[PDB]
């Protein structure tokens, strides 16, 4: 089912700030090589793409890629099957896909000088970090070790090169500025649903506490848990007796309470072990991270919330990776997202696209 | 008219290579913080988006952004009007839009360490360059100085912030590897037309000399001229008597003459002066660069080619900037591109 009919499509930039270099710009002096002198730089802006079907229904969906990724992951799978962008435009939702600040078509703040440095000011760090193919293989649970697949895997085997090519580094932009850009987007588009992934899990939770327009969250395998300030439960270290999960993000309880006002679903794939797994660091990391999220959701529900954890194996889907929405069964994964939208009345009424 | 009917859409990665770190990867060791140890990295790959109409008519178009840009510039204008992607899908062409290696969704090659450095090897330079808003204002000929517009301007005034936000740095990926990625895309697509802009002007010319599937080129304000090796004409310096245009790219004549086998059109907007202008460096730069391109096109035609220069004011369009395809009259600019495709049979199956 590849055909798509759009009432309109396009893209735009939103958010960000400006920084300035020293002095004044003289149009008579050679402009190349580029100089910081007299410069204004736009930094930390976000790229947004939208596609609106004919006669939209329900709330628009905002798909927010995980760490080191772009909106590509919602457009197509590594082997070329339709991504959730196409599937949900066909499902009659207006679909927004973003490249957050520091990723893809979002801004990478660098100037004339060492990476990220504007004269004496470090806007982002010159030293970068970036996962290897091997680190991503085990992070994404293709298998327990690079080159190996779980026998039940839903990964599109044969398209490893395509898959890993979509991943890259992120400069050290503050999470505050990333959240700020998406808050501005959701304010502009109206009531909407956030669909997040991995690193954008905690960021989407934060956006919701700042923006009443977020009416629901579906988070695919969020990477960082969130708790009210001062009320982070003790969580055991990993099986290696040394490592820990990502330090949970703490927000003031007045903001945390807003998470109890909308439906929230965390979706996990397969092959996260139940038992401690000292031989496979990322498998063990996912075990304890999933547990931490269970405690986070419990805190939301004790405030009157509607927060749930969906393990795809319990719904009859086996072998999903950390990217269920590009796996071979992503149509069945999409159906469960449609079910969430229908359960909570988020697919109702004629809707108009605006930003 | 914003409606579009797509038989299919999607995106993929193509091209690139791999580099490796030292040692072995042990899955029992902490994976975070990320390490180069035992690492394989995919670098210099290109992002490609495609949209195919129902019943495509004529060759697919490959829209290739200029320097510091992305495929966004073909999707929408800064004020939110349809870009050439929509306009030419409506015109029944399959449309490819790329983010070249180093830009947008293309790969930026960096690792665990100083930007661009893999252990002791510099894959790209740690020191970056990037235009300011001020430099882009005058490069793009919005006006002669930042904050000023030419009075005839087709720029979408009021949307300056949207416009400049689309621009950014490019790492020092070799032009050879950028050309390589697009050659591989042209192999994948089959016969096609390249529609280039500024920095990708010279790169698209190079691609055509390596890819016979390029059946035509339309280049919006190419930034670097190209000549047969040993046959670069002397070109005068700029009015400040010290600056020069970008050193022209030289290729073997036997590659260069492949450019004579396909139609090629260079498109220039407005407000490039005829007189030397010492007060306005980028205006003078565009004057001498347009002249160099005129000699480049002459070299192609001397070899039996079909190369031409279209000044938009001669076609009745006044006030265009360096981005005619996002200006307020971009529908009329698009009509001139359709005219080129029709003249050369590139809108026919
Ligand atoms: C890199 O180092 C640190 C340290 C700390 Cl404390 N927190 C983060 N945040 C992330 O979500 N980092 S991630 O972005 O690569 C990621 C990690 C695990 C699992 C998944 C992801 C991810 O791809 O989203 N990264
Ligand atoms: C920066 O310094 C050099 C040196 C040399 Cl030799 N060649 C280039 N190539 C470009 O096209 N550089 S550009 O990318 O910023 C650009 C410049 C002028 C006019 C237009 C553009 C452009 O945005 O495409 N840049």
Rounded to whole angstroms, what are the CA distances from A148 to A278, A304, B231?
A: 18, 43, 56
The length of chain B is 349
Which residue intervals of A125-264 are DSSP H helices? Answer: 133-139, 160-165, 175-189, 200-210, 253-256
Closest alpha carbon to B125 in B135, B133, B117: B117
Q: Say if residues B27 and B183 touch (Cβ distance below 8 Å).
A: no
Nearest CA distance, A352 vs chain B (angstrom): 15
Distance in angstroms (rounded) separating the CA atoms of residues A292 and A67: 19
Spell out the residues 6+ positions from residue B309 whose beta carbon is closer than 8 angstroms to its own: B265, B266, B268, B290, B293, B294, B297
| Domain residue limits, chain B | 1-349
Inspect the interface and report whether the beta carbons of A115 and B127 lie closer than 8 Å: yes
Residue A43 tokens read as 């930094």
* A125, A134, A199: residue to mutate for ligand 1 pocket, most atoms within 8 A of CB: A199
**Which ligand is nearest to the Cα of residue A198, counting in written order?**
1
The sign of the dihedral angle between the CA atoms of A322, B40, A159, A93 is positive
Q: Please, which residues have CB within 8 angstroms of residue B68's CB and are 6 or more apart in sequence?
A: B103, B130, B131, B167, B168, B169, B170, B199
In this complex, do A5 and B10 lie within 8 Å of one another by their Cβ atoms? Answer: no
Work out the angle between the directed axes of helices A200-210 and A175-189 (0-180°, nearest 10): 60
CA A234 to ligand 1 center in whole angstroms: 20
Q: In the numeric block, which tokens belong to residue B243? A: 């600056």
**Cis bond upstream, residue A33 (ω within 30):** yes
Nearest ligand to the CA atom of B169: 2
Tokens of B122: 């510099």
Q: How far is the CA of B174 from the centre of ligand 2 (A)?
A: 14
The CA-atom distances, in angstroms, between B213 and each of A335, B205, B260 are 41, 13, 14
Q: Which two tokens stand for residue B342?
A: 């029709």
> Which residues from chain A sit within 8 angstroms of residue B86, using beta carbons?
9-10
- In this structure, what token pair is assigned to residue B127? 């020191």
- Rounded Cα distance between B160 and B272, Å, is 21
Compute the Cα dihedral for A255, A261, A267, A268 and give only its sign: positive
Q: Name residue, tokens 């730069």.
A: B285
* CA atoms in the 13 A half-sphere facing the CB of A143: 13
Closest C-alpha among A323, A168, A325, A178 to residue A249: A178
Residue A69's CB is within 10 A of a number of other CB atoms, namely 24
Dihedral angle of Cα B135, B140, B144, B147, to the nearest 10 degrees: -70
DSSP string for B151-198 = TT--S-TT-HHHHHTT--------HHHHHHHHHHHHHHH-SEEEEEET
Q: Peptide bond preceding B33: is omega within 30 degrees of 0, i.e. cis?
A: yes
CB spacing of B41 vs A132 below 8 angstroms: yes
Token pair belonging to A64: 């927010």
3-state secondary structure at position A253: helix
Q: Do A115 and B133 touch (CB under 8 A)?
A: no
Tell whether the torsion through CA atoms of A353, B2, B5 and B6 is positive or negative: negative
Separation CA A78–CA A67 (nearest Å) = 17
Nearest by CB: A105 against B70, B107, B130: B70
Determine whether the shortest distance from the Cβ of A103 to ligand 1 is under 6 A.
Answer: no
Q: Which atom of ligand 1 is nearest to the CA of A131?
A: 15
3-state SS, residue B199: coil
* B337 contact partners, CB below 8 Å, separation of at least 6: B84, B88, B195, B218
Q: How was this structure determined?
A: X-ray
| Cβ neighbour number for residue B253 with a 10 Å cutoff | 14
Side-chain half-sphere CA neighbours of A277 within 13 A: 19
Distance CA B99, CA A165 (A): 13
End-to-end CA distance of chain A: 28
Q: Please answer yes or no on whether B76 and A10 come within 8 Å at the CB atom.
A: yes
Give A353's contacts in chain B (Cβ within 8 Å): none
Question: How many angstroms separate the CA atoms of B201 and B221, rounded?
Answer: 8
Q: How far is CA B43 from CA A78, A117, B120, in A?
A: 17, 24, 17
Which tokens in the block code for residue A81? 């099957």
Give the closest residue to B267 by CA, choosing from B66, B81, B97, B57.
B66
For ligand 1, atom 23: residue with the closest CA: A67
Residue A76: strand pairing partners = A82
Please provide the DSSP assignment of B203-248 as one string.
HHHHHHHH-TTEEEEEEES-SS-EEETT-PPP----TTSS---PPP
Looking up tokens 């914003």, which residue turns up?
A: B2
Three-state DSSP class for residue B339 = helix
Alpha helical stretches, state H, chain A: 72-75, 84-90, 133-139, 160-165, 175-189, 200-210, 253-256, 281-302, 330-343
Nearest bound ligand to CA A290?
Answer: 1
For residue A215 the two structure tokens come to 């009416």
How many angstroms is the resolution? 1.6
Residue with tokens 């038989």: B7
């Amino acid at each position: 089912k590849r055909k798509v009919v759009l009432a309109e499509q396009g893209s735009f930039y939103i958010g960000g700030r400006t920084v300035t270099g020293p002095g004044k710009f003289d149009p008579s002096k050679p402009v190349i090589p580029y100089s910081n002198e007299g410069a204004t730089f736009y930094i930390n802006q976000m790229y947004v793409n939208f596609q609106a079907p004919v006669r939209p229904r329900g709330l628009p969906l905002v798909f927010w890629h995980g760490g080191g990724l772009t909106g590509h992951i919602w457009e197509s799978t590594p082997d070329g099957r339709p991504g959730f962008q196409t599937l949900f435009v066909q499902d009659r939702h207006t679909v927004y896909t973003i490249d957050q600040p520091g990723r893809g078509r979002g801004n990478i703040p660098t100037f004339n000088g060492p990476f990220g440095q504007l004269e004496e000011e470090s806007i982002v760090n010159t030293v970068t970090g970036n996962s290897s193919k091997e680190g991503a293989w085990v992070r994404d649970r293709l298998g327990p070790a690079p080159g190996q697949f779980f026998e039940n895997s839903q990964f599109p085997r044969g398209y490893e090169d395509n898959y890993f090519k979509e991943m890259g580094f992120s400069p050290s932009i503050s999470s505050d500025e990333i959240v700020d850009a998406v808050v501005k987007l959701v304010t502009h588009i109206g009531p909407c649903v956030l669909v997040t992934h991995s690193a954008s899990g905690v960021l989407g939770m934060r956006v919701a506490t700042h923006a009443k327009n977020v009416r629901g969250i579906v988070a695919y395998e969020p990477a960082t848990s969130i708790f009210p300030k001062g009320k982070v439960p003790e969580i055991p270290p990993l099986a290696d007796k040394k490592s820990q999960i990502f330090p949970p993000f703490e927000i003031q309880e007045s903001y945390f309470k807003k998470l109890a006002k909308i439906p929230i679903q965390f979706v996990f794939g397969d092959n996260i072990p139940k038992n401690p797994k000292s031989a496979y660091w990322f498998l063990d990391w996912w075990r304890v991270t999933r547990y931490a999220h269970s405690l986070s959701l419990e805190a939301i529900n004790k405030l009157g919330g509607q927060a749930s954890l969906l393990d795809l194996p319990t719904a009859g889907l086996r072998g999903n990776t950390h990217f269920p929405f590009t796996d071979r069964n992503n149509v069945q994964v999409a159906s469960l997202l449609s079910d969430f939208l229908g359960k909570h009345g988020l697919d109702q009424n004629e809707s108009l696209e605006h930003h």
